[PDB]
Design a protein around this ligand. Structure first.
Ligand code: NA
Lengths: 59, 255
């Protein structure tokens, strides 16, 4: 449930020769739904712009 | 909670879930499917706890290692740890002992996503000043208590998480907004939470704008002249790996 303690994970990739022009923004929500499933949570809502896909989550 | 996805990174913040290391394999797959290369992984881990505030360090290090087939590992500040696979801005606040007149607004008998109810909450608490109408926002008020908000504005994000339990109330703030002086940003968040104590962690690489200023003696907004109701303690600067620097300041409300 939603209670302390807070947790945080960040993964940064290098864009290199051969990387897809859009990087991680090449993926649609199916990829991120499965990521969130791994912590037994789900997407409550979404906001997107040209730079960021933002997801609010809940168990 | 929150997941943010950008061209070159993923940020996941949660409160009360199972370990986020569970997400590392699929995030790495997402990187490899677009032919990127993982460069940094960082995770929060509490080795040392104080009264106002999981696996062991060894267990989390072993788990993270198991998700990869080399790198260097160590602390950033004392509560976050990195893996760096050798071949921007980030400011975070942690706040303890939240204003009790404010925290009632983050109790609810129903889960409520962005809507009229969270609009009332944001206006009543002043979150509307932190996340003004230049941002695209979405939020969630939890039952019995707790609150999360994400906001985006071009390449910038802000996010706040609130766990207002009376015994050890807590809130966090994070943003990648670039400013030369963060005092207005930080003090705007303090206006909402008026906490008994808080810390600010800022990244200060010499080749970043804020870091170039800091490394040349500039004022960046964390300094005591901006916090007259607080006493500063134990500023700590670390070059946590060659070329990369972190600053932590700590403030306690004058009794
Ligand atoms: Na200070």
């Amino acid at each position: 449930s939603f209670e302390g303690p807070e947790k945080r994970l960040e993964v940064i990739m290098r864009v290199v020769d051969g990387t897809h022009v859009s990087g991680l923004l090449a993926h649609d929500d199916d990829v991120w739904q499965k990521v969130i499933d791994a912590i037994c949570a789900h997407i409550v809502s979404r906001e997107f712009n040209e730079y960021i896909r933002s997801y609010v989550l809940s168990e | 909670x929150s997941l943010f996805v950008m061209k070159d990174r993923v940020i996941l913040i949660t409160c009360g879930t199972i370990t986020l290391l569970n997400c590392v394999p699929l995030i790495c797959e997402a990187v490899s499917t677009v032919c990127g290369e993982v460069e940094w992984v960082s995770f929060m881990h509490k080795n040392y706890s104080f009264p106002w505030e999981h696996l062991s360090m060894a267990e989390e290090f072993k788990t993270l290692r198991s998700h990869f087939p080399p790198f260097i590992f160590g602390p950033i500040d004392s509560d976050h740890y990195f893996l760096y696979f050798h071949s921007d801005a980030q400011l975070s606040m942690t706040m303890y002992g939240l204003d009790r007149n404010q925290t009632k607004h983050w109790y609810s008998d129903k889960m409520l996503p962005t809507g009229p109810e969270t609009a009332v909450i944001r206006e009543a608490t002043g979150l509307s000043e932190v996340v003004d109408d230049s941002w695209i926002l979405h939020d969630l008020q939890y039952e019995p208590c707790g609150y999360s908000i994400n906001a985006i504005r071009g390449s910038e994000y802000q996010t706040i998480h609130i766990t207002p339990e009376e015994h050890c109330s807590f809130a966090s703030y994070e943003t990648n907004t670039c400013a030369l002086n963060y005092s207005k940003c930080i003090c705007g968040v303090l206006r909402v939470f008026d906490p008994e104590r808080f810390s600010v962690i800022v990244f200060i690489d010499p080749d970043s704008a804020v870091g170039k200023s800091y490394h040349s003696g500039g004022t960046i907004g964390v300094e005591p002249e901006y916090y007259p109701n607080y006493e500063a303690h134990h500023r700590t600067v670390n070059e946590y790996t060659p070329g990369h620097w972190v600053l932590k300041v700590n403030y306690v409300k004058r009794a």
